[PDB]
Design a binder for this molecule. Structure first.
Ligand SMILES: Cc1cc2nc3c(=O)[nH]c(=O)nc-3n(C[C@H](O)[C@H](O)[C@H](O)COP(=O)(O)OP(=O)(O)OC[C@H]3O[C@@H](n4cnc5c(N)ncnc54)[C@H](O)[C@@H]3O)c2cc1C
Ligand SMILES: [Ca+2]
Ligand SMILES: [Ca+2]
Length: 430
């Protein structure tokens, strides 16, 4: 009979368990997978460890920065000054070669226009509903706003590619204010936000940081079998796995990805406001992909606008013997069959021309049954309902990026939610 069962060993569940353990409470962690990290994941590609889920971080993200400080992780610098070529692929398929300086000027000036109201709308962005106007703007799509700004062709296409990636969806579906909030969190500053999304990653890898947090937990651990049901009463909670084993505790922290709750039986059932959020709020259809090209392409970056499938194509490595390793982020995996190698290769040739594609490693996060969304992009009309999902239901408590006040599409939000849920249980037990 545990003080707390924590369901899920991604960043939010690990931080929750670390906080409760540090409070002297007894903790059981239950994880479906045989690994830590959740939607962060390190795998081998061509014998090199690569991040294939989330990994970009910045010190303007205070919760992940605090953990990096605690465990001694630094910021690894992406090779931006070394960038040789930048390309924009428009929605109609036309590709243009843009000097990086021009690309940065047009992109950042478009971003500033898109986010110009961030200080008005989000004076206290870690309390993002403080200005009630954001609840009424929730139903405006990112595309509705984008088209109101008088942007030029490159500004429009690059911003729409960015917003397609963040939404994991056509930009007609993304909540406009939910994205502007990230600008506000970055000190209402376009350079800081656009830096945050490209300049740094976790030195040593997200898996090592998860391991360090896990190693600080004094908890029992059960990996490899998913939770199938959760039942609570006035005196406790009982959690049943799909192999029919049963565990019991006074409280339960759920960190499941929002759409996965539909695969778990809750007794009593979750309230209507949570079931509505579970059905409608999330949508991100993302996947990640690494490709090996025989040719040495140098250090290139490509943005492709919707409905091109490869919204961002970054260069992980290049040299005259290796060729090139490309890191590709796909906002809408529905647009390409990632089991079809030659279809992947054809899209690489559309961008990079006369090249030979040798190997591909996709990770389809949307089709992963324990993820189902790549990151908690908020559908228009739903960003302002996130407290319906974050609030406790008696002995059940809820964490995960989607429940965060701040950086809700990020590792930082997952960590925030772990600190917060540890606080809620601290007081529930007082
Ligand atoms: C391709 C990609 C790019 C991204 N880029 C960035 C980025 O640059 N920077 C950034 O900060 N964030 C980024 N993100 C987002 C970030 O990775 C996630 O927001 C964050 O990792 C979510 O943490 P979490 O703890 O909320 O959820 P998760 O990590 O999903 O953890 C939930 C856990 O619950 C487990 N689980 C699911 N079902 C069950 C069940 N029935 N029983 C038991 N356990 C279960 C899952 O296995 C998982 O371990 C990216 C994500 C992806 C996929
Ligand atoms: Ca160079
Ligand atoms: Ca500003």
């Amino acid at each position: 009979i545990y003080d707390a069962i924590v369901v899920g060993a991604g960043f939010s569940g690990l931080v929750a368990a670390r906080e409760l353990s540090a409070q002297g409470r007894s903790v059981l962690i239950i994880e479906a997978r045989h690994r830590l990290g959740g939607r962060t994941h390190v795998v081998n590609f061509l014998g090199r460890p690569v991040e294939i889920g989330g990994a970009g971080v910045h010190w303007c993200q205070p919760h992940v920065f605090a953990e990096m400080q605690r465990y001694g992780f630094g910021f690894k610098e992406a090779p931006l000054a070394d960038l040789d070529k930048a390309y924009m692929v428009f929605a109609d398929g036309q590709k243009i070669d843009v000097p990086p300086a021009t690309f940065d000027e047009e992109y950042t000036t478009a971003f500033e226009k898109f986010c110009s109201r961030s200080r008005e709308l989000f004076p206290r962005p870690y309390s993002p509903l403080d200005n009630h106007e954001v609840s009424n703007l929730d139903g405006v799509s990112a595309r509705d706003h984008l088209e109101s700004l008088g942007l030029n062709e490159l500004q429009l296409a690059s911003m729409n590619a960015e917003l397609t990636l963040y939404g994991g969806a056509p930009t007609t579906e993304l909540s406009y204010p939910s994205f502007v909030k990230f600008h506000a969190l970055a000190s209402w500053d376009t350079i800081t936000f656009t830096d945050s999304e490209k300049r740094y990653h976790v030195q040593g890898g997200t898996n090592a940081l998860c391991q360090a947090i896990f190693d600080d937990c004094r908890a029992d651990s059960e990996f490899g079998v998913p939770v199938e049901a959760v039942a609570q009463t006035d005196n406790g909670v009982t959690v049943t796995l799909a192999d029919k084993r049963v565990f019991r505790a006074l409280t339960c922290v759920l960190t499941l990805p929002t759409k996965v709750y539909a695969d778990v039986r809750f007794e009593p059932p979750l309230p209507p406001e949570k079931r509505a959020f579970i059905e409608h709020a999330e949508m991100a259809d993302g996947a990640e992909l690494y490709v090996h090209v025989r040719q040495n392409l140098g250090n290139t970056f490509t943005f492709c606008d919707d409905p091109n499938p490869f919204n961002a194509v970054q260069t992980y490595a290049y040299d005259d013997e290796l060729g090139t390793i490309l890191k590709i982020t796909i906002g809408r995996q529905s647009l390409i069959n990632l089991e079809n190698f030659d279809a992947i290769a054809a899209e690489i040739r559309k961008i990079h021309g006369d090249v030979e594609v040798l190997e591909a490693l996709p990770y389809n996060w949307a089709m992963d049954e324990y993820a189902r969304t790549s990151y908690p992009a908020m559908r228009k009309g739903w960003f302002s309902r996130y407290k319906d999902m974050a609030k406790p239901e008696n002995r059940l408590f809820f964490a995960g990026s989607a429940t965060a006040d701040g950086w809700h599409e990020y590792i930082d939000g997952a960590i925030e939610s772990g600190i917060r849920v540890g606080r809620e249980i601290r007081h529930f037990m007082k």
